[PDB]
Amino acid sequence: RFRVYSKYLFLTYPQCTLEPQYALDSLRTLLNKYEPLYIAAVRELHEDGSPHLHVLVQNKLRASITNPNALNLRMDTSPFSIFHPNIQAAKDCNQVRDFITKEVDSDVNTAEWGTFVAV
DNA sequence: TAATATTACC
Ligand SMILES: [Mn+2]
Ligand SMILES: [Mn+2]
Ligand SMILES: [Mn+2]
Ligand SMILES: [Mn+2]
């Protein structure tokens, strides 16, 4: 059993090179039932570590995630890997956003959509 | 928490 019920989600996809814009657009539709209001997606590359993606999602309605694989994403080129995330309820949207945007290596590895919600 | 995995607010 896996359950998280929150308007605010913090996702981390380890060992994942997905372009942030395409991950964002895909999570917008997977979460469309909860009316996403803001999403930030960041692809983190750094010389001595594994590449990964973080996503912050702020929804209008409380998301009900009861399947741990509900936000899995598949890349559209060989080897067609499936990326499974760590899913969490965000304790502090401002701290999550600061953490993931301060880690990034360049502004080209960040994607944003919507208006940031002052929680 | 599962289920990716060393990556995941603090
Ligand atoms: Mn990171
Ligand atoms: Mn586990
Ligand atoms: Mn493992
Ligand atoms: Mn952890």
Author numbering: 8 to 126
How do the authors describe this structure?
Replication initiator proteins (Reps) from the HUH-endonuclease superfamily process specific single-stranded DNA (ssDNA) sequences to initiate rolling circle/hairpin replication in viruses, such as crop ravaging geminiviruses and human disease causing parvoviruses.
Additionally, the catalytic tyrosine (though a Phe mutant in the structures) is positioned for nucleophilic attack of the scissile phosphate, where the active oxygen of PCV2 and WDV is measured at 2.2 and 2.9 Å from the phosphate, respectively. In the WDVY106F + 10-mer structure, residues His91 and Asp93 in this ‘bridging’ motif specifically contact the base of A−5, whereas Arg79 and His81 in the PCV2 structure contact the base of G−5. We hypothesize that these contacts play a major role in conferring specificity differences at the −5 position.
